Symmetry: D2
Subunit: 229 residues, 4 copies
Amino acid sequence: SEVVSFSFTKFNPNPKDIILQGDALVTSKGKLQLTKVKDGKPVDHSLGRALYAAPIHIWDDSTDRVASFATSFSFVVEAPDESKTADGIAFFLAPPDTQPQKDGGFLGLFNDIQTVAVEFDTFSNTWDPSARHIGINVNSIESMKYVKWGWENGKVANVYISYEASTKTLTASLTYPSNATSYIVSANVDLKSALPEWVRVGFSATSGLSRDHVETHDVLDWSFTSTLQ
Amino acid sequence: SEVVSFSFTKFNPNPKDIILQGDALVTSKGKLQLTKVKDGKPVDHSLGRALYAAPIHIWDDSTDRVASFATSFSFVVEAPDESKTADGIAFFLAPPDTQPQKDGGFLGLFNDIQTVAVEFDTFSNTWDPSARHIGINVNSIESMKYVKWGWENGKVANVYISYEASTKTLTASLTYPSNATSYIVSANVDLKSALPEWVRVGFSATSGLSRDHVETHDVLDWSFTSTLQ
Amino acid sequence: SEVVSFSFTKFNPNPKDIILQGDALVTSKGKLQLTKVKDGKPVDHSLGRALYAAPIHIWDDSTDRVASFATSFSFVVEAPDESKTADGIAFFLAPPDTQPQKDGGFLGLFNDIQTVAVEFDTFSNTWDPSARHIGINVNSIESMKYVKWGWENGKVANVYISYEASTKTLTASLTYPSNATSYIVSANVDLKSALPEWVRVGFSATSGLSRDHVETHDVLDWSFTSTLQ
Amino acid sequence: SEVVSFSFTKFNPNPKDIILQGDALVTSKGKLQLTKVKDGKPVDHSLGRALYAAPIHIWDDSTDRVASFATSFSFVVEAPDESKTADGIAFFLAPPDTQPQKDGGFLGLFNDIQTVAVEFDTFSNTWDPSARHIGINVNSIESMKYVKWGWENGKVANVYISYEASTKTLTASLTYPSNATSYIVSANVDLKSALPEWVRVGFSATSGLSRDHVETHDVLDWSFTSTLQ
Ligand SMILES: CC(=O)N[C@@H]1[C@@H](O)[C@@H](O)[C@@H](CO)O[C@@H]1O
Ligand SMILES: CC(=O)N[C@@H]1[C@@H](O)[C@@H](O)[C@@H](CO)O[C@@H]1O
Ligand SMILES: CC(=O)N[C@@H]1[C@@H](O)[C@@H](O)[C@@H](CO)O[C@@H]1O
Ligand SMILES: CC(=O)N[C@@H]1[C@@H](O)[C@@H](O)[C@@H](CO)O[C@@H]1O
Ligand SMILES: [Ca+2]
Ligand SMILES: [Ca+2]
Ligand SMILES: [Ca+2]
Ligand SMILES: [Ca+2]
Ligand SMILES: [Mn+2]
Ligand SMILES: [Mn+2]
Ligand SMILES: [Mn+2]
Ligand SMILES: [Mn+2]
């Protein structure tokens, strides 16, 4: 069996165990700023991602086993205007050599691709439900399951995600401690059919393709563990 | 700082680190059977509880600190008839010398008392919402917050509960892996005002006070951790 | 499988997860003071012990399994005179209802009894090697294996103890960080034959039976984990 | 603070979280075979290394903090002849882009270089003590501290290594469970002066430069954790 875990209570400004992609950087104060901010204001057309350095072994063809994992993190999405926001932030798993894919509504994750994501989606695209939502996405920008999400501007959101290999159940929840409000969604997801044996895990985010649809996507901490047995 | 954690993938038939109260017992196969079963059928008027042996330090008056904790477990509630069920199962915290309190709708936890509970309530009492529900209860059988719960007869439910001391946020969720359906509720709870400095943690359950309102309340596993710093 | 672990970076002055026996107490500053101190000076004829509250499951007759465990702690033994010292401090495992046994050279552990101990023995009794020593003791005050120990008056000692069930190997080591000096001893120990299925773990210590053979026995921290599978 | 840990109870034959260097490979049965074996016999002039994929943050110049870490593993060194053996196996820390250095007595680690190692040295070079030894090495093939080591041909050795940042104490021990025999050495080591802020950790080994001084260097498992706070 092979267990792997890590925790950051904040991020190091030059983080060698984190692969930063696109616009992503860590601030002096240790926030993982996925999308660009200039003079303290979020900018449009931005895409950033961050992956943990070590690959994770999520299934093994030889032994026919699948990993179980769990992760928590908290994040903030702040927009200068509440009524126009885009595009969102996601936690994801993809092949180890994964690179940024399409910006805007594609969240840096998908395009016209093996990636499973839990998305916190702030803009209704042609493929989306009408309301902001938390979605579970398997190799598509279209979610197989979602829950309507009452996004709170600038408030810290706490997230817990777990995957139980014995039942193929992926569950994601979000809670705003400021008003004790929570949301949850689950799905049956076969990681062996969706992903390769080894993946990297992390975050992706994009700001809108227009000046009036901008927001930040900052991650404040992160813990992860996975066991393959 | 003082960290305490434990995990059981199943329970030992004579469990010395578990204080069994009322009707509670562990089966030969390692299930924690909180309420009585006779010839394989659940019996009425039953009350059982189970506490971890070691007290947990949840706050300290001298240093003014409060613990954060998290717990997962899975459980089954099976009734011979889906339309009449009672009374439910709870995870709870109470003083270390806690003893069983009122049966039936009081869940073994409350009466006409310092106890904080997350309840999985299968019968609408005079104090309850109309539907089955998951409730967060602070020193009362009346929940301060609840979510409507679509109870699935005989299916395994997975539970995750966390408490973040820095925000006083208690969150509880339930997922049925069989159909990837989930529920979540949160509340702001001040553990210093509700509970003493040291508590014991565990489970309580009760079957109905009538022959036609019976069900099992079995816990299949359990993991817990708490940190005070 | 059933995992249990705990860590204290210091001890609480009124510790509910620690069963204090004999003279043992926790100081205002959070040291576990096993033997008596009066006006800051150690007193003779003292015996103190401390056990973690939860029993540990070290073997199971039904499944024929044995636990593996590991523990670290640091401690200080300070004597007003380096040349006359007694009697020592031990880490031990015993039945859950274990009570203090003979004082002086018997270390609170043995007498004229199921207890396995790793002893840090500061006085040569009729049954001891000539020099101060670290011993592994199985149901006897006579050690089955020992290593000569250059005790450093008043210096912090770091201890690591592990037990590998697959090989029945118990190993104990001590290091003084002040001068990077270390000692180690191991033994083959069958826990099933020496101990019952469930035990409590902790510390015992005794000061000499004469006024000129006194010392402190203080534990500064402690971490423990055990897994039965 | 930032915690990182991993455990392997055996190694995967194509291990993506392990960077294999030189001759190192993982066998079908999951052993990490650092030096070459042909027809089941060890070959001369071999050098292999293995590093965990994620860099470890061992100190931070900005916050002036240093990590504490601990690691266990077990290994086998088997020679066809007990009286002529070379060269040995080591656990080490080096910059993330570390590459194999000199073969033979240099253990793949050093040359005519920032690397700190705990070495299990089976051949007395001009720079070595006369007997086989366990050494602590800071930027040199010459050990600053060592203990004489009674190497047991083909027996499993269990190793525990810890580093306490608060005292700068590095300690390494080895135990053979087959005959309950153990060895320990410690040293004061300043990781900030010896190493860069970020390192990779792992193993290196070399077989002798002559046909009559060959042995295997196989690692059977591995666990590691480090915390920077
Ligand atoms: C297809 C696509 O990326 N569409 C984007 C959408 O995601 C959002 O960024 C919007 C903001 O005005 O701009 C475009 O419509
Ligand atoms: C007050 C109280 O415990 N009421 C109980 C209720 O909880 C449930 O057990 C019911 C089943 O017929 O019987 C009584 O009404
Ligand atoms: C048998 C026994 O406990 N002997 C004790 C010995 O352990 C030590 O305390 C000594 C100090 O003067 O006093 C007695 O000899
Ligand atoms: C300097 C150097 O690597 N010396 C090596 C020594 O380490 C060992 O491999 C020996 C075996 O015959 O061969 C050479 O002497
Ligand atoms: Ca969208
Ligand atoms: Ca009710
Ligand atoms: Ca003695
Ligand atoms: Ca050598
Ligand atoms: Mn969407
Ligand atoms: Mn209710
Ligand atoms: Mn002795
Ligand atoms: Mn050497």
